Structure 1
Amino acid sequence: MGSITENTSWNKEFSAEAVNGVFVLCKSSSKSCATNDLARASKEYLPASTFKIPNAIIGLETGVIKNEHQVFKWDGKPRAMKQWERDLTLRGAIQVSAVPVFQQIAREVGEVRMQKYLKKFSYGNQNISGGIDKFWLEGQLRISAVNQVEFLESLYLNKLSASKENQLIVKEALVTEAAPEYLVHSKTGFSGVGTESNPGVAWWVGWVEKETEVYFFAFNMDIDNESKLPLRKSIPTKIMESEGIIG
């Protein structure tokens, strides 16, 4: 990233909901990004389910995921959310955010390869300690909104250290809104409600293509009650609607 510039006009969307959080928005490239909070833009948080993006790429690159038509079969044993109790494609597993599919991917990738790829991707603090199947859920890995937009820009441009076909496969799995005039790729996350005096984090990260332009975005907020979870999309959506990007 080049520079990060404060835009105070976005604060109103946070204060109206009593949300402590940050939005980072970059037109064309991470050369120039805007944010409501310079300090929070670079503060690092657990990635939670946003980690499915690098994890999917690493799974493909290592051959743990064979291709985009692989079916991750459900063994019929209880999973923590009922929407995960079914056979899933890669896109299906990302869209329903099926943690156990990605835990098994991570186990098969292994610590050595996982560390190597997070270094190649400059992914956050690159700290995978805490258990190979949970470091991004409750371990020591942390990433900022700025770093998310840098990582997503590389993915958009096919510039990550991975094959172009594998980056294209994961990008297809990340489409969340299609209109004739714009296309959104994105991923949500929610670490949990945290503990006393130590809130969890909620995320929405991605990019928007409109006309011949591209906008990279990353939102996070502190959260201690799950009723507030939809704000992770509604606050940044309102900002991007106000900017004329979506809608």
Structure 2
Amino acid sequence: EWQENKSWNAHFTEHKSQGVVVLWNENKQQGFTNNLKRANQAFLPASTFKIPNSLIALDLGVVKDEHQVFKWDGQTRDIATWNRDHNLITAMKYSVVPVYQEFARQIGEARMSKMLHAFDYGNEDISGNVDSFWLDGGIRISATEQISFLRKLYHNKLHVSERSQRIVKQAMLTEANGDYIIRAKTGYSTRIEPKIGWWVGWVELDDNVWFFAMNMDMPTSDGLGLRQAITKEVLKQEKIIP
């Protein structure tokens, strides 16, 4: 069951932007969105792909655990936090592309393609360079398809070990207080038009879970903070978080 609530469009319009927010109430098995066409439009996943990439690397032994250190290659890049050592947790927190490109190269085309099909992930198409296909290749995924995948991850139903899914869910931890827990991943797609930002994940409450997936036009890096700000406003409006 799905419900469209165009009143939420104000959260994007007021910032001279456009996007979609999709919510899923797990207890009630009901969905909500401001825009239902865009909810089903497929975009590059960009750094939201670090989730499936982490799951595959762990299950194949490319990553031993969340403590294994991945040494900086000594190449200075324009993101300061990337020019240092990382483990799965910090590479995830700072969306460290070069670490995950190496994950992909060791995974390889065959295993990556097979596991994205087993995940039923997006259009399951890895056409392009194995170390960049989620940034400028043919893979595509929608917000509603992001939800479907995250729900399986939450329930440990993806076709990898329970251990692998617990570790990635730990790495996704974003916010925790006495009222809620958020596990999520950001994305920022710029190599193919239209440029967008992602935020996908879920909110853990005492007796329910709310999955969310949002994307929004992002012509400049100046609006990246709106990915989280807009989503949280919707959650507040719907009285999901205070």
**TM-score range for the pair, normalised by the shorter chain length:** over 0.9
Give the SS at the match of 2:108.
Answer: helix
Q: Does 1:246 align with 2:206?
A: no
1:75 match: 73
1:99 match: 97
Give the SS at the match of 2:222.
Answer: helix
Match of 1:180 among 172, 178, 181: 178
Q: How far did 1:246 drift?
A: 2.0
CA deviation digits over 1:80-104, x for unaligned, max 9? Answer: 4221111111010000110000000
Q: Which amino acid aligns with 1:236?
A: T
Higher strand fraction (1 or 2)? 1
Q: How far did 1:199 drift?
A: 2.5
Q: Which amino acid aligns with 1:56?
A: S
Superposition pairs of residues 11-30 of structure 1, within 5 angstroms = 11-28=9-26
Superposition pairs of residues 4-43 of structure 1, within 5 angstroms = 4-28=2-26, 31-43=29-41
Aligned length: 242
Q: How far did 1:29 drift?
A: 6.0
2:203 match: 208
Distance (whole Å) between structure 1 residues aligned to residue 221 and residue 22 of structure 2? 23
Q: Does 1:221 align with 2:216?
A: yes
Q: How far did 1:78 drift?
A: 2.0
Distance (whole Å) between structure 1 residues aligned to residue 129 and residue 28 of structure 2? 32
Q: Does 1:139 align with 2:134?
A: no
Is the CA contact 1:207–1:216 (under 8 Å) kept in the aligned structure 2? yes
Distance (whole Å) between structure 2 residues aligned to residue 30 and residue 134 of structure 1? 38
Task: Structure 2 unaligned segments of length 5 or more: list them.
Answer: none
Is the CA contact 2:55–2:168 (under 8 Å) kept in the aligned structure 1? yes
Match of 2:190 among 189, 192, 217: 192
Q: How far did 1:4 drift?
A: 2.4
Q: How far did 1:75 drift?
A: 2.7
1:159 match: 157
Q: Does 1:45 align with 2:43?
A: yes
CA deviation digits over 1:24-58, x for unaligned, max 9? Answer: 00011694211001111110000000000000000
Is the CA contact 2:179–2:241 (under 8 Å) kept in the aligned structure 1? no
For residues 151 and 29 of structure 1, do their structure 2 counterparts lie closer, same or farther at Cα, with a shift above 3 Å needed? Answer: farther
Q: How far did 1:212 drift?
A: 1.1
Give the SS at the match of 1:106.
Answer: helix
Q: Which amino acid aligns with 2:195?
A: G
Give the SS at the match of 1:143.
Answer: coil
Distance (whole Å) between structure 2 residues aligned to residue 244 and residue 232 of structure 1? 19
Q: TM-score, normalised by structure 1?
A: 0.94
2:59 match: 61
1:84 match: 82
Q: TM-score, normalised by structure 2?
A: 0.96
Is the CA contact 2:27–2:208 (under 8 Å) kept in the aligned structure 1? no
CA RMSD in angstroms comes to 1.4
Task: Structure 1 unaligned segments of length 5 or more: list them.
Answer: none
Runs of 4 or more consecutive aligned structure 1 residues displaced over 3 Å after TM superposition: none
For residues 58 and 168 of structure 1, do their structure 2 counterparts lie closer, same or farther at Cα, with a shift above 3 Å needed? Answer: same
For residues 144 and 225 of structure 1, do their structure 2 counterparts lie closer, same or farther at Cα, with a shift above 3 Å needed? Answer: same
Distance (whole Å) between structure 2 residues aligned to residue 180 and residue 231 of structure 1? 24
Distance (whole Å) between structure 1 residues aligned to residue 135 and residue 234 of structure 2? 28
Q: Percent identity?
A: 49
Distance (whole Å) between structure 2 residues aligned to residue 157 and residue 85 of structure 1? 35
